[PDB]
């Protein structure tokens, strides 16, 4: 309860950790820890009745986040872990269910069959992109096929529980915390041309309420990099 890091403080009360490993450390690299280990809280999204989903590409969502966005634009490469806290607060009179996964290497498929999706339609820096529940038309400029029942990656959406995940069921549970280590082939990769994680939130059982309750439930995502280092002089 009320854990702090740097000059920030959030509070909790169950933690699911990665693929069984805690994130640890390894020219010679430099290891910054004093000014970056803090909880970057993204601005909250609203879960309405007919909502469909959200995704954030993870080492891109902190690209305009102040000092961490100055370590990225000064340094070519880098390897980080992550620690995500998702918590939505509804009353005892709301009902629904979320699925909070964290997909490594989530290559997405374009709407047009011949091209590839462009940069702005894949990754919104510190802003959520949204799934839909219809098909997206093909003769446009360039967009992502965001039908939610194929999860944007051509795979069945029920099978997404093989990735490290957590359910948020508003009847019993309230929050979900994940810890994700460094999952990559090369030991240090470029952070401007590679989004090595993707946090998805998919509401399976949609929201419902009676007339009079608040017609929206907000969702707060809080990311905090742990065990980060760069290669530079």
């Amino acid at each position: 309860r009320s854990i702090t890091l740097g000059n920030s403080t959030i509070t909790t009360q169950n933690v699911v950790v990665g693929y069984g490993v805690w994130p640890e450390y390894l020219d010679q690299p430099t290891q910054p820890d004093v000014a970056t280990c803090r909880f970057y809280t993204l601005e909250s999204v609203q879960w309405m009745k007919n909502s469909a989903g959200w995704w954030w590409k993870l080492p891109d969502a902190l690209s305009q986040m102040g000092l961490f966005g100055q370590n990225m634009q000064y340094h070519y490469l880098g390897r980080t872990g992550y620690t995500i806290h998702v918590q939505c607060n509804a009353s005892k009179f709301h009902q629904g269910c979320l699925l909070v996964v964290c997909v490594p290497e989530a290559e997405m498929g374009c709407s047009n069959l011949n091209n590839t999706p462009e940069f702005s339609e894949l990754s919104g820096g510190d802003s959520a992109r949204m799934f839909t529940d219809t098909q997206v038309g093909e003769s446009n400029a360039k967009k992502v096929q965001t039908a939610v029942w194929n999860a944007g990656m051509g795979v069945g959406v029920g099978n997404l529980t093989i990735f490290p995940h957590q359910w948020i069921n508003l009847r019993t549970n309230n929050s979900a915390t994940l810890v994700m280590p460094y999952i990559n082939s090369v030991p240090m990769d470029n952070m401007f041309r590679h989004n090595n994680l993707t946090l998805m939130i998919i509401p399976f059982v949609p929201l419902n309420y009676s007339e009079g309750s608040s017609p929206y439930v907000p969702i707060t995502v809080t990311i905090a990099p742990m065990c980060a280092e760069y290669n530079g002089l």
Partner: antibody
Framework: QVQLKQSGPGLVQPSQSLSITCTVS????????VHWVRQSPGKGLEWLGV???????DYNAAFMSRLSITKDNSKSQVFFKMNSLQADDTAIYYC?????????????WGQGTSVTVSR | DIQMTQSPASLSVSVGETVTITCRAS??????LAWYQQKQGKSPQLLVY???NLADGVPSRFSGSGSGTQYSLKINSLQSEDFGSYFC?????????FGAGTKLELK
């Protein structure tokens, strides 16, 4: 929250060019695309063109050589140009943002600038 | 391209009935349809997007349904502000085409 608005000429001579500029507030141009819809009481609503959030644009087929839409991300402005302006363009002109929860529908519309092309 | 045929051209109903407006497409659009309501002398307001979902400030009187090439919009109980112009418009592929339009007199 305050939203987009536009400002144009109002009247133009035939076989000239047309220039309206739509300026937004409350959101950025790197997350939503802006459309152009022409309300004419003789032909109903018609869709002219759009510039997506990536920067690449897409126009109607019947107005390909006449339209040129552009935007600039820093100044929060768009610029669209129409030329050769025949007498069937006596209508009112709207700019409206798209991508209402990622669904490519017009969220909120401008106040509109009515144009008339006669002398 | 794809043409939208909206019917009827106008209506004359009173306050407190049900009303159904349908518009048919040329081919399949996969539920990518938006409905707008316009009053006199103003910009249109979005009513229903993607053929089922209601908008933000729109009350639950309106209801849209359909799949494939036939869609429909239903208002269960009229009020004293639901008269004006109504359009249906698809966003499947450019060129996006609007409907013909309909009117409510509220005699």
């Amino acid at each position: 929250q305050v939203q987009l608005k536009q400002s144009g000429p109002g009247l133009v001579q035939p076989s000239q060019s047309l220039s309206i500029t739509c300026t937004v507030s409350g959101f950025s141009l790197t997350n939503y695309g802006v459309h152009w819809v022409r309300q004419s009481p003789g032909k109903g609503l018609e869709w002219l063109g759009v510039i997506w959030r990536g920067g690449s644009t897409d126009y109607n087929a019947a107005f390909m050589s006449r339209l040129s839409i552009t935007k600039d991300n820093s100044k929060s402005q768009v610029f669209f140009k129409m030329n050769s302006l025949q007498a069937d363009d006596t209508a009112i002109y709207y700019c409206a943002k798209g991508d209402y929860y990622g669904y490519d529908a017009m969220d909120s519309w401008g106040q509109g600038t009515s144009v008339t092309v006669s002398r | 391209d794809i043409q939208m045929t909206q019917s009827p051209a106008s209506l004359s109903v009173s306050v407190g009935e049900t009303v159904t407006i349908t518009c048919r497409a040329s081919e399949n659009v996969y539920r990518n349809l938006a409905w707008y309501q316009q009053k006199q002398g103003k910009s249109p307001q979005l009513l229903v997007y993607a053929a089922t979902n209601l908008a933000d400030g729109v009350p639950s009187r309106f209801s849209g349904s359909g799949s494939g090439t036939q869609y429909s919009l239903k208002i269960n109980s009229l009020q004293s502000e639901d008269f004006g112009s109504y359009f249906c418009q698809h966003f499947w592929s450019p060129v996006f085409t609007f409907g013909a339009g309909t009117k409510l007199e509220l005699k």
